[PDB]
Nucleic acid binder design. Structure first.
Lengths: 198, 151, 47
DNA sequence: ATATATATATATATATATATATATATATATATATATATATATATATATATATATATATAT
DNA sequence: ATATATATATATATATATATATATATATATATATATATATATATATATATATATATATAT
């Protein structure tokens, strides 16, 4: 709407010039950068000792010296790991506190971007639908202030559960098939794993 | 027996909830809670379309491949029919295919999708919605179910 | 995943050279174009 | 004896000079968008010609 | 007789020129990036002057 039309463009001109997560993706070296940093943080997100990170990064740096165009240092990869952690602090990718480095939120967004990007299989998956389903049901039922309507909700849901209880009394249980189970599991991982986000 | 006990505990939960509701003790999403709750539910759906994107790309690519391969004279009629059937089965069993198939299966039980759209309308009616979502988001969510069906 | 521990850099090297969106985010003019395009499509729901 | 009080000693902080690590100003090269140019395609108009269908003259 | 054949106009197509917009490509100027020379911060040995106490004299 016009309310934000003219304003928004400037809102984006700003982010391009200053916001880190965007700035990184503009730099030529962005691929190696983001790959390596994902590598570093993946092992655990509780926080890494600085020089432990120096060591692991230097190890990863040598792995990719074969990427010739970026001239990854050879005579002392450990020193280069240090000179590059300096950069990822100065560029606000990793604030370090308590002596252990960490990933600025800008890095979280940038990383969750590239992952979704490539054409490997998707972030969401089938269960997502049943998820929005049940949550919408619950969200409506709660949001509804009319008490008789909550009564109707409870009556219908309890009658459903009564059907299934009677069936279970007769032993008519059913379970996900590997298809469904695997799908739901990947979904649930991708779901709770967003709580960690903010 | 595990499922039996699960059902027993759930029915007891809902029994207590009904007893409270009949006593007049219903509870509403406190006005601020509702806002974030809605923002959450919106964010949840905000993936489905962006992945039907890839469902389209995959089946489009499969079609392009089957065409491009049909030029091979070497292919008997029986070869091409088999290639078709196998391409479709493969594209179906892949995750995006599983998503598409799940969606389609839902369409057999249309009542669920229709009820979902109904509840979406009811939700977007509530005043809090205006705060939780600018005009555009409310528009799109109001018309989610369609924008999947069409897709 | 361990294979991906090296192959991953390959994917990202790929995206930054070919994938449209990524390439878009890079060019200098990008924000203006992206903002405007959203402005257009924003109203649209059938194209 | 215990307690005050002694010169010397233990241990230290500071100072000088040395080397190495880091931060920065600057240079330079490469990557990239953008202007200029030639050839192409689109569409216009202008005009000639071909086409269908009918008006019309005609055979038997 | 019924129906056949020619001339006319009309409706359409084709052809040509002018112009403009497009696309493909060259050359250019600009920006990012990495590379460099310099000055400065950390760590160290030796040496000295210092505070704390031993070691110690001396005392009640």
């Amino acid at each position: 709407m016009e309310e934000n039309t003219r304003q928004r463009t400037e809102n984006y001109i700003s982010a391009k010039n200053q916001h880190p997560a965007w700035i990184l993706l503009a730099t030529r070296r962005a691929p190696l950068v983001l790959s390596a940093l994902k590598t570093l943080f993946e092992k655990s997100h509780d926080g890494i000792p600085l020089e432990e990170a120096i060591q692991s990064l230097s190890s990863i740096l040598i792995e990719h010296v074969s990427q010739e165009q970026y001239d990854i240092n050879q005579d002392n990869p450990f020193l280069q790991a240090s000179r590059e952690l300096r950069e990822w602090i100065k560029r606000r990718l990793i604030v370090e506190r308590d002596g252990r480095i960490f990933a600025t939120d800008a890095l979280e967004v940038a990383i969750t971007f590239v992952e979704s990007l490539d054409n490997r299989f998707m972030t969401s998956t089938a269960s997502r639908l049943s998820t929005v389903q049940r949550e919408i049901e619950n969200l409506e039922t709660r949001l509804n202030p009319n008490p008789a309507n909550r009564v109707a909700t409870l009556r219908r849901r309890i009658s459903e559960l009564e059907r299934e209880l009677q069936e279970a009394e007769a032993g008519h249980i059913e379970v996900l098939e590997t298809h469904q189970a695997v799908e739901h599991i990947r979904d649930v991982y991708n779901l709770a794993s967003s709580l960690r986000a903010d | 027996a595990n499922r039996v006990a699960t059902l027993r505990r759930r029915i007891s939960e809902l029994e207590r909830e009904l007893q409270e509701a009949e006593a007049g003790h219903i509870e509403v999403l406190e006005t601020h809670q509702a806002v974030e709750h809605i923002r959450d539910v919106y964010n949840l759906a905000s993936s489905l379309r962006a992945d039907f994107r890839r469902v389209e790309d995959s089946w489009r690519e499969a079609d392009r491949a089957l065409r491009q391969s049909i030029i091979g004279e070497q292919y008997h009629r029986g070869d091409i029919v088999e290639r078709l059937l196998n391409d479709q089965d493969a594209l179906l069993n892949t995750p995006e295919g599983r998503v598409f198939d799940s969606f389609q299966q839902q369409l057999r039980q249309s009542s669920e999708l229709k009820a979902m759209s109904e509840r979406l309308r009811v939700i977007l009616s509530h005043p809090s919605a205006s705060d939780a979502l600018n005009r555009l988001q409310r528009h799109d969510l109001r018309w989610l179910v369609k924008r999947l069906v069409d897709e």
